[PDB]
Amino acid sequence: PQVQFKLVLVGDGGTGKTTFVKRHLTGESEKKYVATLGVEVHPLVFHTNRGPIKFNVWDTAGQEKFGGLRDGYYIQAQCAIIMFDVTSRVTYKNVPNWHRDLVRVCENIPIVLCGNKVDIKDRKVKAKSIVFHRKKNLQYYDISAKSNYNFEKPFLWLARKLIGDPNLEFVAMPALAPPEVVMDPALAAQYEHDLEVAQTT
Amino acid sequence: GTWDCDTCLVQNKPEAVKCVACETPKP
Numbered sequence A: 001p002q003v004q005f006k007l008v009l010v011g012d013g014g015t016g017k018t019t020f021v022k023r024h025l026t027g028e029s030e031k032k033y034v035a036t037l038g039v040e041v042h043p044l045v046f047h048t049n050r051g052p053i054k055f056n057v058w059d060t061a062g063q064e065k066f067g068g069l070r071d072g073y074y075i076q077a078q079c080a081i082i083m084f085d086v087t088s089r090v091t092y093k094n095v096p097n098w099h100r101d102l103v104r105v106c107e108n109i110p111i112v113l114c115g116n117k118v119d120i121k122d123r124k125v126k127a128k129s130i131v132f133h134r135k136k137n138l139q140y141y142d143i144s145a146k147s148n149y150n151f152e153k154p155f156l157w158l159a160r161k162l163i164g165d166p167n168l169e170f171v172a173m174p175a176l177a178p179p180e181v182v183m184d185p186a187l188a189a190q191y192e193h194d195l196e197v198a199q200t201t
Numbered sequence B: 001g002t003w004d005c006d007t008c009l010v011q012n013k014p015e016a017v018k019c020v021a022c023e024t025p026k027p
């Protein structure tokens, strides 16, 4: 039977959750609408050195703007991605709230913290301010949904955590929507170095 | 043996009548 995990994708409205999950073309063409919960589940296959693994990513239909999400959304999640927007400081301010909501219902599942929109010139939530992950087996990645930047990173970290294999690799990138903006190789380099510099503090 | 929900893809244990997640009945 196919190896697959429910992944819940939470975070403030407007952080780019829908834009992000949709980069994965087959996940978008094969997505399933769940009316009872107002959710779309995107089946995201990744081909690893040990075979295919499927992340069934649960994307909201906007309800997160009006309150916490219901239990049935979280139920049986095996991993999660928490997203904020590095152009909106309040979205990062809400991260602990999502974590709390998530852990209340799912326990100690593998979780990755993502700061989306790093393609945008005037960044507000920089490396040195990003601290929530350090404390709780939370890995962090900068991402840019619109540019596909670091798209595979959260998925690879979760794969390695769920399978229990540190040496797991993706043999090939999934077919993704072509970037709508360009991620400056220099910014990527500086933001990447900024995170390592910070991780030593 | 457990079963996959055709609506939301969640795995339910063989006993359940409807999906513990989306309340969708078992085929």
Ligand SMILES: Nc1nc2c(ncn2[C@@H]2O[C@H](COP(=O)(O)OP(=O)(O)O)[C@@H](O)[C@H]2O)c(=O)[nH]1
Pocket (backbone or CB within 6 Å): A012, A013, A014, A015, A016, A017, A018, A019, A020, A062, A116, A117, A118, A119, A120, A143, A144, A145, A146, A147
């Ligand atoms: N510049 C930029 N804009 C983005 C990115 N991701 C999403 N957006 C924009 O942010 C807005 C909200 O995105 P959406 O995916 O609907 O956020 P959601 O409410 O979290 O699902 C949309 O106008 C997107 O085009 C990104 O990586 N870069």
Ligand SMILES: [Mg+2]
Pocket (backbone or CB within 6 Å): A017, A018, A019, A060, A061, A062
């Ligand atoms: Mg959305």
Ligand SMILES: [Mg+2]
Pocket (backbone or CB within 6 Å): A024, A025, A026, A028, A029
């Ligand atoms: Mg498509």
Ligand SMILES: [Mg+2]
Pocket (backbone or CB within 6 Å): A026, A045, A173, A174, A175
């Ligand atoms: Mg593909």
Ligand SMILES: [Zn+2]
Pocket (backbone or CB within 6 Å): B005, B006, B007, B008, B009, B010, B019, B020, B021, B022, B023, B024
């Ligand atoms: Zn279901």
